[model samples]
Target chain A: IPKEMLRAQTNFILLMVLKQGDNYVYGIIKQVKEASNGEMELNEATLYTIFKRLEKDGIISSYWGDRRKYYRLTEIGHENMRLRHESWSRVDKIIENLEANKK
Target chain B: AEIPKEMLRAQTNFILLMVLKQGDNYVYGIIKQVKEASNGEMELNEATLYTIFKRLEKDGIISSYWGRRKYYRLTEIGHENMRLRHESWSRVDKIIENLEANKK
Candidate 1:
């Protein structure tokens, strides 16, 4: 798996997981591993860095859980997901066309 | 669609491999082909282009010859690498499609 792809989709992935429900860092990591079919293994340091950025950007909010910190998507995060879905669909179409031409 | 910078780099590598596979071996031609292939969605800075060229050569995935202008061609490993990367991207695209469906 390309680290570049994983890095680029970090925010989108986080938002997707959070949309389900609030989750702690470890839980998010598990979801990502499952999502990518174990191709992406994010380290704790990198995950925390993204958590901080998402919080700072107002895309997500964090709270103290009984045993650990938890995160959930903010309204802005949902909106961002919607916008990214639109953009990503366009990109997908382009890639499909490019693939066909390559063949 | 806004291409993520990191994903753009990955695309750059794959496109370079495809260009070499097509026998357009020089940097200038490869760059032009990539831009045209992506409909101008992809462009490579000269420095970045050379950086990837050198890295591929160093990794033995591509071989370069000194002609009037330097030329590159894919090695056996390079072909395999491109195939693997393309498959990976296909899996990724499927995952994205599933996510979109679930979200809706």
Candidate 2:
């Protein structure tokens, strides 16, 4: 579990987790663990901070559901996800190139 | 090819191992190879690169030598380190893929 990469990409990751549908903080934590096959250990402060950033940025909006406040990605959020996916894809490719042998 | 600074930091240790597995290098050559390979997108400094060398040397994953009196070479343990990194990055690649796929 590369915590550095996970922490760096926390915003996009949470949005991706919300891809599983609406969620609360605990639910998001569960999915982060699930997606990593129980390897992820996100910082508690970092996770809450992202919630604030996403909410403030309007990348996510919340509504009361049952007894919990559920957060879901906005169209803006999805677009940002798309934007980051493209950026991340390029970075991955660059690393693979750097990692290639010969010479 | 603009990698985020954090992404570069995250990948640098494994990058060092992978490069050394290909061939031994001193700090200068190590930095050179990584820079050229990345088209200069992945430059690394002495403090950042040498600190990794120090810890890895203690773990016996890599050992130091010199024509520069300071070349670093991967040990058997270090090659295994490289292999494990391959699998780890493979898993991360898939995990990233899965996340995006679930979205779209």
Candidate 3:
């Protein structure tokens, strides 16, 4: 997959896990669906592919707990989240300001 | 369809627009929302999304921050770009619709 696709998936996975009170791999998938109102459609193959990529990039780390693998965001992932947030915020503010100026 | 650069850019823009529409959100949140909005039809890889994110940020279309966690937001330029893209999409939609109507 390309870098953009990887980043999007990584960010999405991280957000899902973070929002759900920091869970493991199984719980991360569950939380993603929950956050998306059951809209996340991840096949095992594709998801696993992304998982490996994230791990390689140090965006996420996995460990075994209760005989199951649990994945969580690394410091790099956290940095990514902050950058994305700032970018979107700026856009929103611009739109609001434009409307304000128009009025 | 084979993914073209324009198609990819449009897809990314659409996904980002949807995320922004959901109000303030982070990378993870955007991914979840995008997947949900597209009914999981859109499967963007993590690296691809990050690359786009970096490009968007570099273009001043987006910005970022870090608190207890990282957050991604849009910029003034992003809004303008979106508006332009939306207008272009409207035109493209009309043309495609016309073509489809003529076909078959």
Candidate 4:
């Protein structure tokens, strides 16, 4: 992933799960694997570091459920994702033009 | 300087490679071509352009000649590198689309 360009690539995947508020850590990992259709796997160390960093940055918070902690996206994180999505639209157009002129 | 080098680094390289793929070009021409091709969404500083040139040259992905200041062209490796990078970015683009759609 170009050494995790722009937004640590894992950040996108992990947050998608928490954005769903679907499950716990391993559950999130399972979803990532499922979404990737087995082409990608997120290990504990890589997954945990992002969870650690995002929560520290106030992007991720958790609630207790099934007697275990589960990550959820905060409002700030949602805003951040919106910004990234909009930014990607710009980038996508730029790339589209470059490809058009690439010949 | 404020923008992290890593942020623009690959993109700059990609755009440069794309420009070079069109035809061999000199420094300022490459700069002009990049902005024109990207519809002004990308503008390369002359200095940063040269650093990317130097790095790609050193990395064996591009070559240069001339003394109009200088001319640049993609090496065989440069062409392949361009395709590889394009494919990689395509992967990321699709994933971004998927995630954005999955946003909930």
In candidate 2, what are the lDDT values of residues A1-103, reduced to their tens digit? Answer: 3455445556556767786688888877765766677777566677778788768877889899869988898888778667656765755565577556352
**Interface quality of candidate 4 as DockQ:** 0.28
Model 4: residue B51 alpha-carbon error in angstroms:
2.5
lDDT of each: 0.71, 0.71, 0.59, 0.69
lDDT of 1 by residue, B3-104 (tens): 445545655575567667767468787666566656887677889988878888898899988888988888998888777767865766665555555445
Runs with alpha carbons beyond 4 Å of true place in candidate 2? A1-15, A19-21, A25-63, A72-103, B1-6, B92-104
Candidate 4 C-alpha lDDT tens digits along A10-87: 676677666665568787766666556676677888777777887887888878985887788889888877766665
Model 2 steric clash pairs: B66-B69, B66-B70
User: Which model, 1 or 3, shows the larger DockQ?
Assistant: 1
Candidate 3 docking band: incorrect
Q: Which candidate do you rate higher for TM-score, 1 or 3?
A: 1
Tell me the deviation in Å of residue A18 in model 1.
Answer: 3.2
Steric clash pairs (candidate 1): none
Recovered share of real interface contacts in candidate 2: 0.17
The Cα error of candidate 4 at residue A68, in Å, is 2.0
Candidate 1's displacement at residue B43, Å, is: 4.3
Error of 4 at B74 (Å): 2.3
Top DockQ hit = 4
Model 2 chain B: worst 10 consecutive residues (lDDT sum): B1-10
Write out the backbone clash pairs for model 4: none
TM-score of chain B of each: 0.72, 0.72, 0.72, 0.71
lDDT per residue, candidate 3, B1-104, as tens digits? 12235434744675575466445567776666555544465566778778878877887777888878788787777777667756644543353343333334
In candidate 2 the C-alpha lDDT for residue B18 amounts to 73
